[PDB]
Design a protein around this ligand. Structure first.
Ligand SMILES: [Mg+2]
Ligand SMILES: [Mg+2]
Ligand SMILES: [Mg+2]
Ligand SMILES: [Mg+2]
Ligand SMILES: [Mg+2]
Ligand SMILES: [Mg+2]
Ligand SMILES: [Mg+2]
Ligand SMILES: [Mg+2]
Ligand SMILES: [Mg+2]
Ligand SMILES: [Mg+2]
Ligand SMILES: [Mg+2]
Ligand SMILES: [Mg+2]
Ligand SMILES: [Mg+2]
Ligand SMILES: [Mg+2]
Ligand SMILES: [Mg+2]
Ligand SMILES: [Mg+2]
Ligand SMILES: [Mg+2]
Ligand SMILES: [Mg+2]
Ligand SMILES: [Mg+2]
Ligand SMILES: [Mg+2]
Ligand SMILES: [Mg+2]
Ligand SMILES: [Mg+2]
Ligand SMILES: [Mg+2]
Ligand SMILES: [Mg+2]
Ligand SMILES: [Mg+2]
Ligand SMILES: [Mg+2]
Lengths: 113, 138, 328, 101, 132
RNA sequence: UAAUCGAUAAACCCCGAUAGACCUUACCAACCCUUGCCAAUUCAGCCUAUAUACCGCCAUCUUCAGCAAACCCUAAAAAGGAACAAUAGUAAGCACAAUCAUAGCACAUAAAAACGUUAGGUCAAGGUGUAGCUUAUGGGUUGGAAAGAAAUGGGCUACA
């Protein structure tokens, strides 16, 4: 008993919010993306391969969760955590007079355990 | 139509300890391909302009590491195979930040960092003077 | 495959609408220029071949052009040259020959009536007109073409052009004319600048053999060169290096009429001199007329030097010197 | 099992070198100095000679992780020049590509 | 003749995927790398530590999904958590697919002391790019 | 000499080795252990033979362009298939070409170079079909693996 379910493309709304579909980093599942994207080197008579079963699309990182609308929506909620920079230190001439000491610290991030 | 109600409940408190000031935050993003770096640069600029940071972005020169190996298995030294490793750099220069603003920007940057790139963070912490140097005489 | 393309059109439209919705721009004002940027941002595929990057265009742009249905439902072909193999090319040749015959008859009648009102329009040298290449003909005629057939078509077009052209004949020929505009290799002349009460001021840049030089030239000062804060004689003890500096000024007779400061980094003794020479030649264009700029660019002053060191190859000594090959 | 008996013995050599890393580091201080008299340095020579042979890091050989090849192994990936090519050509290693310039 | 990562041409009936249809000299030109991490950068370290894990993951997934694996794995390494993207033929029932994915997402995490995500894309058959 | 091996016409000779005081080392002499790396297996383990069984990888023609599925034709067909003012040739595809990289073009370089030939090199990168070891052709420790009568290949130093 084999079952073949149609993807989300036929059910995607025209004005549906995209961050709701792609909130975090995803492996770019073709069933959740209604955009027909062809990636790959074309053939002499053929065309670049579609999004179904295309390994090249899964290889590349996808920024579908970082669309400008989602960036604006996320950054709007982050205004509550940030603090205001004092306007009295706009120019470095007064910064040198007030806090002459500079402390350089190095921080690194790397993928792995 | 079915939108949940009362979806926001954060835990934010303000302490009496003065916030840390930073003069310059340098972000060196190293990667293999330039398209990912350009997309990340656009994402970082869009995120920083919303918070009002006035980020300066410039591209440091690339670095290419090439090495040579034997082409055959047992004995063929006249024929070689050369492999190349490219490293492209992006420099994000942030100025006039506070301890909390830098923390939240770094959170929003690292939480969405791609898998094929790495990032080096250099913070220029601002400090006036320690206690034993203000006006002592031995 | 007509229905496949028809469905692909609808899928492309709905995908464009969804892309506009997710990007935040107006779908009505959404164009292919925005589509390219949206694809590049959403799918940042870093590859050296641009055709390997993800692309979303119209089906008529992505899928190749398709030959039209050559016959009806009754089996009868539409065009009368279907059984000739290349119906489009042979119809084009037949139309060209029919127009040639019509032009010949019209010109014969005009000559019999002693009427010569046509002119010679074949000479299109100032316009820069060329004939279609085989690829440019095969992109027009969907079916494949042959070199001999293309040569025959070109030689029939020249025969048609060699005769007094009519009103419509010249227009028909013009669609096979490609107006290549790559002839004005004239360089851009930097306008004379005035900075901080200084007159006759110009700047030039040069690069030769990993040596980058920038020259600042004043046309109101005396003839002298200051290189990296020291005199040019001290910086270039070799006679040849100073002859390289003299080469641009001597050609324009501007030896003692310009004061120049040069900053050159990288390269060796001769590479720096060559880069300074190129930068000075490029900077001297502003102080001279146009007829002398062409004289310098025909003398080699305004052309860069692509002669760079070649990379060493494996199994060799100096990228050309091979190892001692023993025959036995 | 391991790839080869040579690799199995090299694992034991590395374990013994790590076990005796502190003792040899402390002993070599008495031998590499000139302030202390040579009379104790001579005895320290016997003390370090009495140590087991496989305790010194010199016996450690850098082989391949996959095929335990004694030579032709890059230090960065700890893999032989042949397994490294077999993986790079398949594309399982990021940033590695044929050099074209 | 070069033979590394190169599938030879048969009489004209062999189905070949896009990854196999391109020679290794087309890497980063027409096809991308099968794995992404930071150990292969310039000023980074721990390259062999990730390489041995990548090889173990390739072999372990090849043995875990026998005969239903279409193409090679895509191993993303993003902030201490590793994602494994696989293309699987729809040969096994979903009940058996979920059992395997749940077993793997725990066994790999406990074995490598790092969070693991496993994503599967079910294909009706192997996708053919060149002649078949 | 008790003391490896392979390569050894173009395509071997600063070649495996981008690398030998113990290790590397598969060689030898002295000595020890034989379900002896693994959870287990009348099992492990063998650098034992066969590259004239292999795969994986390369050399050569080779910067030569041909190979080849589906077809068609020949007063039969082993086989061949061309006349551009064209006389039976269409041809998916693999090659070539194009494209890509040496961060602007052009050039150049790099890269690529199909089907096959040399029963070409590699059981010693690694796994291996067949034939052979199991108190040994297996597994551990120590010490030695010289030396040049002579011939030769490639490089450095010079003979000013
Ligand atoms: Mg030389
Ligand atoms: Mg074995
Ligand atoms: Mg060693
Ligand atoms: Mg020998
Ligand atoms: Mg022999
Ligand atoms: Mg040699
Ligand atoms: Mg020995
Ligand atoms: Mg043995
Ligand atoms: Mg053979
Ligand atoms: Mg042999
Ligand atoms: Mg051909
Ligand atoms: Mg006959
Ligand atoms: Mg034939
Ligand atoms: Mg063909
Ligand atoms: Mg190029
Ligand atoms: Mg070229
Ligand atoms: Mg070559
Ligand atoms: Mg080519
Ligand atoms: Mg033989
Ligand atoms: Mg031979
Ligand atoms: Mg064997
Ligand atoms: Mg043997
Ligand atoms: Mg021994
Ligand atoms: Mg000799
Ligand atoms: Mg000499
Ligand atoms: Mg000397």
């Amino acid at each position: 008993r084999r079952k073949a379910l149609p993807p989300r493309t036929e059910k995607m709304a025209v004005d549906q919010d995209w961050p709701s579909v792609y909130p975090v980093a995803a492996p770019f599942k073709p069933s959740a993306v209604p955009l027909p994207v062809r990636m790959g080197y074309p053939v002499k008579r053929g065309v670049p391969m579609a999004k179904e079963g295309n390994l090249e699309l899964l290889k590349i990182p996808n920024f579908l969760h970082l669309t400008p609308v989602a960036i604006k929506r996320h950054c709007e909620a982050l205004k509550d955590f940030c603090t205001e920079w004092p306007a009295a230190l706009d120019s470095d001439e007064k910064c040198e007079k007030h806090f002459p000491i500079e402390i350089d610290t190095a921080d690194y991030v790397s993928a792995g355990p | 139509v079915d939108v949940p109600k009362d979806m926001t409940k954060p835990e934010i408190t303000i302490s009496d300890e003065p916030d840390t000031l930073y003069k310059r935050l340098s972000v060196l993003v190293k990667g293999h391909d330039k398209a990912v770096l350009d997309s990340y640069e656009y994402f970082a600029v869009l995120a920083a302009k919303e918070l009002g940071i006035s980020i300066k972005v410039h591209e440091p020169p690339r670095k290419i590491e090439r090495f040579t190996l034997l082409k055959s298995v047992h004995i063929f030294k006249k024929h070689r195979v050369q492999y190349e490793m490219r490293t492209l750099y992006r420099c994000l220069e942030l100025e006039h930040l506070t301890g909390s603003t830098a923390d939240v920007y770094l959170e929003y940057i690292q939480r969405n960092l791609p898998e094929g790139v790495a990032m080096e963070v250099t913070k220029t912490k601002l400090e006036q003077l320690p206690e034993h140097i203000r006006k002592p005489i031995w | 495959t007509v229905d496949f393309i028809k469905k692909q059109i609808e899928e492309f439209n709905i995908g464009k609408r969804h892309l506009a919705n997710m990007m935040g721009e107006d779908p009505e004002t959404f164009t292919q220029e925005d589509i390219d940027r949206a694809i590049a941002y959403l799918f940042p595929s870093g590859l050296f071949e641009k055709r390997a990057r993800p692309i979303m265009k119209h089906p008529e742009e992505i899928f190749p052009k398709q030959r039209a249905i050559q016959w009806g439902e009754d089996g009868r072909p539409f065009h009368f040259l279907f059984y000739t193999g290349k119906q489009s090319y042979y119809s084009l040749m037949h139309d060209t020959y029919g127009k040639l015959l019509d032009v010949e008859k019209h010109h014969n009648q005009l000559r019999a009536k002693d009427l010569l009102a046509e002119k010679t329009k074949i000479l299109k040298d100032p316009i820069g007109s060329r004939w279609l290449i085989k690829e440019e003909l095969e992109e027009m005629l969907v079916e494949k073409l042959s070199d001999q057939d293309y040569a025959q078509f070109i030689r029939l077009l020249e025969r048609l052009s060699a005769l007094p052209c009519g009103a419509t004949e010249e227009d028909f020929v013009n669609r096979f004319r490609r107006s290549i505009p790559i002839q004005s290799k004239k360089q851009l002349i930097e306008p004379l600048q005035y900075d901080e009460q200084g007159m006759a001021f110009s700047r030039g840049e040069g690069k030769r053999k990993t040596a980058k030089a920038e020259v600042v030239v004043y046309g109101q000062g005396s003839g002298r060169i200051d290189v990296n804060g020291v005199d040019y004689l001290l910086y270039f003890p070799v006679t040849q290096d100073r002859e390289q500096l003299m080469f641009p000024l001597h050609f324009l007779d501007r030896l003692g009429k310009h004061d120049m400061t040069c900053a050159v980094s990288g390269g060796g003794r001769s590479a720096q001199a060559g880069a300074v020479r190129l930068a000075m030649a490029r900077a001297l264009c502003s102080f001279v007329t146009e007829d002398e700029v062409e004289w310098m660019r025909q003398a080699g002053l305004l052309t860069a030097d692509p002669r760079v060191r070649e990379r060493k190859k494996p199994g060799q000594e100096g990228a050309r010197r091979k190892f001692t090959w023993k025959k036995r | 099992y391991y790839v080869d008996w040579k690799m199995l013995r090299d694992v034991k050599r590395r374990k013994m070198a790590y076990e005796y890393a502190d003792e040899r580091l402390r002993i070599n201080s008495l031998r590499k100095n000139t302030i202390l008299p040579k009379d104790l340095q001579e005895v320290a020579d016997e003390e370090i000679a009495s140590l087991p042979r496989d305790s010194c890091p010199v016996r450690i050989r850098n082989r391949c992780v996959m095929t335990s090849r004694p030579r032709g192994v890059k230090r960065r990936w700890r893999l032989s020049r042949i397994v490294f090519r077999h993986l790079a050509d398949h594309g399982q290693l990021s940033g590695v590509q044929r050099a074209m310039w | 003749k070069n033979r590394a990562a190169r599938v030879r041409v048969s009489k004209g009936d062999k189905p070949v995927t896009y990854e196999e249809a391109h020679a290794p000299h087309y890497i980063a030109h027409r096809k991308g790398w099968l794995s992404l991490h930071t150990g292969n950068l310039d000023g980074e370290d721990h390259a062999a530590e990730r390489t041995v894990e990548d090889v173990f993951l390739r072999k372990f997934m090849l043995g875990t999904f026998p005969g239903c694996l279409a193409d090679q794995l895509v191993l993303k390494r993003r902030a201490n958590q590793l994602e494994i993207c696989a293309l699987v033929l729809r040969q096994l029932p979903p009940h058996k697919f979920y059992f395997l994915v749940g077993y793997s997402e725990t066994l790999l995490s406990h074995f490598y002391k790092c969070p693991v995500h496993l994503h599967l894309q079910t294909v009706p058959s192997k996708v053919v790019y060149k002649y078949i």
